[PDB]
Design an enzyme around this catalytic site. Structure first.
Site, PDB file in Angstrom:
ATOM      1  N   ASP A   1      19.800  -1.736  41.239  1.00 55.00           N
ATOM      2  CA  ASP A   1      18.847  -0.692  41.064  1.00 55.00           C
ATOM      3  C   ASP A   1      17.654  -1.392  40.224  1.00 55.00           C
ATOM      4  OD1 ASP A   1      18.328   2.430  41.298  1.00 55.00           O
ATOM      5  OD2 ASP A   1      17.535   1.513  39.377  1.00 55.00           O
ATOM      6  N   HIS A   2      17.981  -2.267  39.199  1.00 56.75           N
ATOM      7  CA  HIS A   2      17.261  -2.600  38.175  1.00 56.75           C
ATOM      8  C   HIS A   2      16.404  -3.869  38.677  1.00 56.75           C
ATOM      9  CE1 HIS A   2      19.393  -0.356  34.712  1.00 56.75           C
ATOM     10  NE2 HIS A   2      18.920   0.460  35.756  1.00 56.75           N
ATOM     11  N   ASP A   3      16.739  -4.261  40.035  1.00 56.27           N
ATOM     12  CA  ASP A   3      15.741  -5.259  40.663  1.00 56.27           C
ATOM     13  C   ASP A   3      14.847  -4.663  41.346  1.00 56.27           C
ATOM     14  OD1 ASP A   3      17.101  -8.193  42.480  1.00 56.27           O
ATOM     15  OD2 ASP A   3      14.975  -7.577  42.056  1.00 56.27           O
TER      16      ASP A   3
HETATM   17  C1  HEM Z   1      25.702   2.662  32.726  1.00 54.79           C
HETATM   18  C2  HEM Z   1      25.497   3.366  33.905  1.00 54.79           C
HETATM   19  C3  HEM Z   1      24.234   4.053  33.885  1.00 54.79           C
HETATM   20  C4  HEM Z   1      23.686   4.851  33.235  1.00 54.79           C
HETATM   21  C5  HEM Z   1      23.774   4.906  31.709  1.00 54.79           C
HETATM   22  C6  HEM Z   1      22.143   5.075  34.032  1.00 54.79           C
HETATM   23  C7  HEM Z   1      21.164   5.928  33.361  1.00 54.79           C
HETATM   24  C8  HEM Z   1      20.202   6.677  34.000  1.00 54.79           C
HETATM   25  C9  HEM Z   1      18.958   7.188  33.471  1.00 54.79           C
HETATM   26  C10 HEM Z   1      19.115   7.371  32.001  1.00 54.79           C
HETATM   27  C11 HEM Z   1      18.216   7.173  34.363  1.00 54.79           C
HETATM   28  C12 HEM Z   1      16.880   8.257  34.642  1.00 54.79           C
HETATM   29  C13 HEM Z   1      17.236   9.701  34.382  1.00 54.79           C
HETATM   30  C14 HEM Z   1      15.787  10.460  34.259  1.00 54.79           C
HETATM   31  O1  HEM Z   1      15.407  10.715  35.564  1.00 54.79           O
HETATM   32  O2  HEM Z   1      15.231  10.939  33.350  1.00 54.79           O
HETATM   33  C15 HEM Z   1      18.666   6.648  35.586  1.00 54.79           C
HETATM   34  C16 HEM Z   1      17.938   6.324  36.835  1.00 54.79           C
HETATM   35  C17 HEM Z   1      18.442   5.465  37.934  1.00 54.79           C
HETATM   36  N1  HEM Z   1      19.701   5.126  37.935  1.00 54.79           N
HETATM   37 FE1  HEM Z   1      21.078   5.389  36.634  1.00 54.79          FE
HETATM   38  N2  HEM Z   1      22.402   4.972  35.156  1.00 54.79           N
HETATM   39  C18 HEM Z   1      23.592   4.191  35.379  1.00 54.79           C
HETATM   40  C19 HEM Z   1      24.122   3.627  36.513  1.00 54.79           C
HETATM   41  C20 HEM Z   1      23.535   3.651  37.844  1.00 54.79           C
HETATM   42  C21 HEM Z   1      24.087   3.163  38.917  1.00 54.79           C
HETATM   43  C22 HEM Z   1      25.620   2.869  39.180  1.00 54.79           C
HETATM   44  C23 HEM Z   1      23.117   3.260  39.963  1.00 54.79           C
HETATM   45  C24 HEM Z   1      23.219   3.146  41.131  1.00 54.79           C
HETATM   46  C25 HEM Z   1      24.191   2.576  42.124  1.00 54.79           C
HETATM   47  C26 HEM Z   1      21.975   3.910  39.440  1.00 54.79           C
HETATM   48  C27 HEM Z   1      20.788   4.219  39.793  1.00 54.79           C
HETATM   49  C28 HEM Z   1      19.561   4.654  39.177  1.00 54.79           C
HETATM   50  C29 HEM Z   1      18.258   4.736  39.779  1.00 54.79           C
HETATM   51  C30 HEM Z   1      17.737   3.943  41.128  1.00 54.79           C
HETATM   52  C31 HEM Z   1      17.543   5.311  38.755  1.00 54.79           C
HETATM   53  C32 HEM Z   1      15.970   5.405  39.031  1.00 54.79           C
HETATM   54  C33 HEM Z   1      15.265   4.008  38.180  1.00 54.79           C
HETATM   55  C34 HEM Z   1      13.843   3.960  38.220  1.00 54.79           C
HETATM   56  O3  HEM Z   1      13.369   4.273  37.009  1.00 54.79           O
HETATM   57  O4  HEM Z   1      13.077   4.019  39.183  1.00 54.79           O
HETATM   58  N3  HEM Z   1      22.264   4.230  37.960  1.00 54.79           N
HETATM   59  N4  HEM Z   1      20.090   6.252  35.352  1.00 54.79           N
HETATM   60 CA   LIG Z   2      12.576  -7.297  42.264  1.00 53.89          CA
END
Ligand code: HEM
Ligand SMILES: [Ca+2]
Ligand SMILES: *[C@@H]1O[C@H](CO[C@@H]2O[C@@H](C)[C@@H](O)[C@@H](O)[C@@H]2O)[C@@H](O[C@@H]2O[C@H](CO)[C@@H](O[C@@H]3O[C@H](CO[C@H]4O[C@H](CO)[C@@H](O)[C@H](O)[C@@H]4O)[C@@H](O)[C@H](O[C@H]4O[C@H](CO)[C@@H](O)[C@H](O)[C@@H]4O)[C@@H]3O)[C@H](O)[C@H]2NC(C)=O)[C@H](O)[C@H]1NC(C)=O
Ligand SMILES: *[C@@H]1O[C@H](CO[C@@H]2O[C@@H](C)[C@@H](O)[C@@H](O)[C@@H]2O)[C@@H](O[C@@H]2O[C@H](CO)[C@@H](O[C@@H]3O[C@H](CO[C@H]4O[C@H](CO)[C@@H](O)[C@H](O)[C@@H]4O)[C@@H](O)[C@H](O[C@H]4O[C@H](CO)[C@@H](O)[C@H](O)[C@@H]4O)[C@@H]3O)[C@H](O)[C@H]2NC(C)=O)[C@H](O)[C@H]1NC(C)=O
Ligand code: HEM
Ligand SMILES: *[C@@H]1O[C@H](CO)[C@@H](O)[C@H](O)[C@H]1NC(C)=O
Ligand SMILES: *[C@@H]1O[C@H](CO)[C@@H](O)[C@H](O)[C@H]1NC(C)=O
Ligand SMILES: *[C@@H]1O[C@H](CO)[C@@H](O)[C@H](O)[C@H]1NC(C)=O
Ligand SMILES: *[C@@H]1O[C@H](CO)[C@@H](O)[C@H](O)[C@H]1NC(C)=O
Ligand SMILES: [Ca+2]
Ligand SMILES: [Cl-]
Ligand SMILES: [Cl-]
EC number: 1.11.2.2
Lengths: 466, 104, 466, 104
Positions: D94-96
């Site tokens: 996701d972070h990529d």
């Molecule tokens: C250690 C596990 C994980 C978190 C802690 C975590 C936290 C978040 C937060 C705080 C956000 C933003 C919430 C908001 O809208 O205010 C968030 C966004 C996204 N996640 Fe999370 N995440 C954890 C783990 C996952 C896993 C396992 C993911 C996918 C399999 C996953 C995805 C995403 C995505 C795509 C977003 C949006 C990112 C963006 O800023 O574009 N997360 N998560």
């Molecule tokens: Ca990328």
């Protein structure tokens, strides 16, 4: 930088440069004036530049009523409760309404004849005076609005001005929709593209995006190939109305004085009906009245419309020919030989390759109008795809489409199915002989003409509130 | 957007209730394909001297017009099956659909 | 202002309102902190608001290298010509590299253990320290880059720093693509949705839009349902690493001090391999570690991740459940009975309707994660469609896709096909027993595990410049 | 965009030659469907007291979470066929792909 008076390339100007051995402009330090289209998000270093539509995309006669509230109100007669559109208070056309005059800082219409002092007209859209033939159509529809509001006022005494206005505007809007989809589009697309892009209407779909696509603003300019080099005017027996029956188009642009002082809209409407349009052929694409002398009377130099179209598509960042072919699911020619096969014209394909180097870079208007026209149509596959796709969205994605359940009653739709452009002309002009439907096909008097007395008028009885 | 209405708004706002600006005036055009600018986001092809488009020099718009569009007016072919009203309705209809503002 | 410290709804804040009788936030006038995503065109009265992707959309390991040049250069060891990534100068993990520390203003990591004074880590992406398990993966890939650059330098002595960095970076990006499409995505989508949305790669298509779609940023959050309430840590015999082998997640968020001072990344990587993920079930969607106590140590109160996902989708103007089902060519349930049928759970359908009233308004994340999981997949039809559609565009629309003609040689492609996450772990840590392929399915020691010594190294012979 | 190249740029710029910002960093997301805002262009549903969405009140995200997402932690079901690494790669991946910036 003043884009009208300087050839310096700096925001917001994008002047067209002049090539060596130009047929008209021997001075290469000159240029053809061009202002970039206003950016939707000015100065952004994040957004990909896009342009703006100042009008409602819907086929809703916004060119009659306006697309912004201040204007729409100013186009209305508020002096009474009749629901009418305001008319010219200084001139009439044989006892009939002209459009009110507009109040512009640098009125181009005044420049088309200094002593006449006839300004541009005020309408729902800013371009009503661009040519007298377009002005005639705006005036025709303005009269139909008031005629409808008058009959409606008889059928429904209780209806106030607002109600009459909205009911008349709703009928006019449906008329533009019916004329456009029933009579015009089939003759643009041809039978095959019509069935493919505009299948039988079902009902309103709120998931259909009704916005005009950026490419459409350039693609729909295919109509530039239909333009004749003259404005033709005929009298009540359809003969050349002297002393100037065939005026060069380069002296009719913004020439509002001609409507007011040269016989009104009847001579012009009869000319449109009884004169063939120009046919688009691959080496007869667009006439020099618009290619060499566009707006010659109202600015420092004559413009080139076909050239402006190509500069505009680049201004708007529009993809090249092959990208639009791919979008439409059409084969993308890569060599001059392949382009020749697609165009059924090797000579044109060679000229195109010599200019662009690759069919990937052909500007959308140029490529689109270059294609052989579909059977019984006046555009090729690419433009048919772009234009048909646009119009289906404008139909299916319109909550107020005239055929959508709830907009009109079953009996109201039956009455509206009898409308026609020829009938509207009969109802709002001194012309008593008009084209046989289809008006877009008929073009030869008297073979293709009939008396107005033979055409049933729109029956508003099913509009009675009782 | 009003829960219920009787007629079109003048701006086109609220025709589409889920996305109220769709089809309304003074809004950006929708893009059927991503834009193609010289720098990727703003400059038109032909802006910067020497900058090619997809491997080739940009042709001057006026040059393409002179070479491909220009034709002797006496060769004009009157369309036997369309009236000039066919052209004129086209322009009228275009002006119901789109107007692209520019700076004065 | 400060959206973190007040409940005033004014730009740029959109605080979550609290329902009456909330089991945690008893004062109903208070709120959950929320900042609106930055608009693409600030303050515009023309554009439809849109949000920004700060990262490259491509699967190119930008979370390692950075998506902006200044950052990219700051992540690199510029003190020599070995083409390495900079490593922490203050701490090592049993002799192995750790990420360097970042220099943040209100560093959240320092807050998680005030006395430890360990700041957040600096990486290609700003969120590397969000949880130690994520930090461990970031650290693993940084080591792999350096390992690759070192071997490449032995293979090609004339290669300078820029060349070594670029060649190592290219391999790391390829590794992320392969693990993702070969091992991960099939287990997310299920075999049926994998074949439908990810048919065999044919070639780079320059007409495929590779951008991330707004909806994907929310839909891919399906992963939150996989999160376990603890960070599990295991010793070299895969037994609980005392004194604390199970740390509540609410005390590991931004806890970079645990990587530096509590045993490095090995116990964390072992815990990730030999512990099951949480299964998403319709009455077991997401845990309170993230629903009640998200970021508890670095915020005035614990946040609610599921709720934030829903507030985010509204901030982003995302259509509701049915519009997305329609987009995906899936049936749109209009009643509680129809939703009951789609979800194969009338109880859940009823609960959704009591909250939302219409399936047209269910937020995309909520509706998405509510659907029953596809066979051998961990998402339902809607999320499969959105996720599968996105990854196809990222693959087909990537000029640097690892299998694209001209990116790698045939022999390089043969070598890259042998990479695996278990091997990468073996190459860059003190762990000598790792999961059997597929690492994402394997989850039970010792059953699903094998010796690193049975797994061959990536053969770099074909990177030798002849 | 250079005529040729051997490596990705850091920003993603020039990956797509014809539209060089596609997939590049610090650009607007692409929309697969038109946005749905209270005023049609900017305000999120739930912003203005009393403004319903499509005929129904906007459900509090926190209420939906409480009534639909909340469950007893001891009821958690271990996935017999997935490792926690499956969860972690998802976040890493996701972070990529995407990070949506907010004001600090
Ligand atoms: C250690 C596990 C994980 C978190 C802690 C975590 C936290 C978040 C937060 C705080 C956000 C933003 C919430 C908001 O809208 O205010 C968030 C966004 C996204 N996640 Fe999370 N995440 C954890 C783990 C996952 C896993 C396992 C993911 C996918 C399999 C996953 C995805 C995403 C995505 C795509 C977003 C949006 C990112 C963006 O800023 O574009 N997360 N998560
Ligand atoms: Ca990328
Ligand atoms: C390279 O990729 C191009 C993009 O492909 C998409 O993404 C990849 C990853 C795959 O998933 C692929 O399956 C996707 O299509 C691809 O070009 C695309 O090709 C398709 C098929 O020809 C084009 O679809 C056609 O579109 C036209 C135009 O309308 C479209 O756009 C409007 C506006 O957004 C929409 O409202 C429409 O619904 C369409 O989406 C349609 O006229 C046409 O439909 C009509 O014709 C077909 C055939 O007779 C009938 O079945 C229909 O009923 C209609 O009568 C198609 O829908 C698509 O526009 C085009 N996209 C782009 C960006 O150019 C290209 O083919 C790929 N090349 C190779 C070698 O793989
Ligand atoms: C109401 O109108 C909706 C819009 O319809 C379009 O415009 C009108 C004017 C007509 O011309 C119509 O023909 C046009 O389609 C309409 O919703 C639309 O329904 C279609 C069909 O279900 C949807 O297409 C599916 O899309 C998904 C998602 O991918 C699409 O979007 C991405 C991103 O932009 C593109 O890259 C893709 O190329 C797609 O365009 C696809 O997953 C799916 O394809 C897959 O499934 C089919 C069938 O199994 C396979 O053949 C394919 O190979 C794939 O495996 C479809 O392409 C379209 O997204 C959707 N649009 C909207 C706005 O929701 C709706 O059905 C109409 N309702 C009624 C009652 O008329
Ligand atoms: C009397 C006949 C017509 C003109 C005179 C005329 C003139 C123009 C001009 C000056 C422009 C702008 C050129 C530029 O880009 O700098 C232009 C734009 C458009 N046209 Fe033209 N046009 C006449 C006639 C037609 C007909 C018959 C058309 C359609 C069948 C037609 C269409 C268009 C369209 C769609 C545009 C763009 C409008 C916009 O601003 O969005 N024109 N034309
Ligand atoms: C308004 O309507 C009345 C009656 O038709 C007419 O006398 C008057 O001139 C109209 N005013 C304008 C500005 O058109
Ligand atoms: C200009 O208008 C006047 C009337 O004011 C008319 O007599 C004259 O013929 C017009 N000029 C031209 C060149 O047509
Ligand atoms: C750079 O590389 C050298 C040799 O590997 C190492 O000693 C030094 O610590 C590195 N510097 C950084 C900032 O990582
Ligand atoms: C904080 O870090 C120190 C080491 O610097 C450690 O001894 C202590 O246990 C940590 N505090 C907690 C609550 O874990
Ligand atoms: Ca309109
Ligand atoms: Cl477009
Ligand atoms: Cl979207």
């Amino acid at each position: 930088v003043n884009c009208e008076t300087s050839c310096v390339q700096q925001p917001p100007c994008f002047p067209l440069k002049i090539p060596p051995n130009d047929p008209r402009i021997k001075n290469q330090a000159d240029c053809i004036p061009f202002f970039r289209s206003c950016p939707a998000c000015p100065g952004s270093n994040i957004t990909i530049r896009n342009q703006i539509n100042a009008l409602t995309s819907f086929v809703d006669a916004s060119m009659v009523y306006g697309s912004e509230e201040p204007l729409a109100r100013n186009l209305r007669n508020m002096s009474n409760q009749l629901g009418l559109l305001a008319v010219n208070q200084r001139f009439q056309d044989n006892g009939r309404a002209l459009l009110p005059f507009d109040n512009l800082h640098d009125d181009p219409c005044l420049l088309t004849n200094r002593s006449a002092r006839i300004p541009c007209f005020l309408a729902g859209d800013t371009r009503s005076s661009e040519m007298p033939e377009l002005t005639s159509m705006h005036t025709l529809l303005l009269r139909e609005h008031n005629r409808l509001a008058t009959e409606l006022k008889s059928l429904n005494p209780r209806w106030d001005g607002e109600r009459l206005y909205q009911e008349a505007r709703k009928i006019v809007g449906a008329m533009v929709q019916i004329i456009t989809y029933r009579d015009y589009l089939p003759l643009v697309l041809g039978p095959t593209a019509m069935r493919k892009y505009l299948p039988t209407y079902r009902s309103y779909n709120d998931s259909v995006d009704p916005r005009i696509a950026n490419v459409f603003t350039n693609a729909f300019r295919y109509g530039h190939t239909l333009i004749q080099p003259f404005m033709f005017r005929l009298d009540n027996r359809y003969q050349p109305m002297e002393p100037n029956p065939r005026v060069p188009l380069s002296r009719v642009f913004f020439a509002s004085w001609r409507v007011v002082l040269e016989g009104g809209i009847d001579p012009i409407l009869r000319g449109l009906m009884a004169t063939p349009a120009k046919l688009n052929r691959q080496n007869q694409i667009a006439v020099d009245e618009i290619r060499e002398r566009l707006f010659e009377q109202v600015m420092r130099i004559g413009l080139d419309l076909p050239a402006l179209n190509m500069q505009r598509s680049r201004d708007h960042g529009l993809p090249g020919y092959n990208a639009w072919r791919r979008f439409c699911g059409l084969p993308q020619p890569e060599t001059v030989g392949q382009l020749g096969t697609v165009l059924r014209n090797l000579k044109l394909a060679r000229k195109l390759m010599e200019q662009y180097g690759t069919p990937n870079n052909i500007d959308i208007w140029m490529g689109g109008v270059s294609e052989p026209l579909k059977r019984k149509g006046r555009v090729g596959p690419l433009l048919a795809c772009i234009i048909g796709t646009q119009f289906r969205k404008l139909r299916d994605g319109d909550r107020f489409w005239w055929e959508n359940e709830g907009v009109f009653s079953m009996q109201q739709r039956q009455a509206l199915a009898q409308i026609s452009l020829p009938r509207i002309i009969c109802d709002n002009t001194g012309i008593t002989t008009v084209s046989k439907n289809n008006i877009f096909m008929s073009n030869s008097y008297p073979r293709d003409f009939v008396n107005c007395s033979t055409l049933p008028a729109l029956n508003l009885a099913s509009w009675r509130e009782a | 957007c009003p829960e219920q209405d009787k007629y079109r708004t003048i701006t086109g706002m609220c025709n589409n209730r889920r996305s109220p600006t769709l089809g309304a005036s003074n809004r950006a055009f929708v893009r059927w394909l991503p834009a193609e600018y010289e720098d990727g986001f703003s400059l038109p092809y032909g802006w910067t001297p020497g900058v090619k488009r997809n491997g080739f020099p940009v042709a001057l718009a006026r040059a393409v017009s002179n070479e491909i569009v220009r034709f002797p007016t006496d060769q004009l072919t009157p369309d036997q099956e369309r009236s000039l009203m066919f052209m004129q309705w086209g322009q009228l209809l275009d002006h119901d659909l789109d107007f692209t503002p520019e700076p004065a």
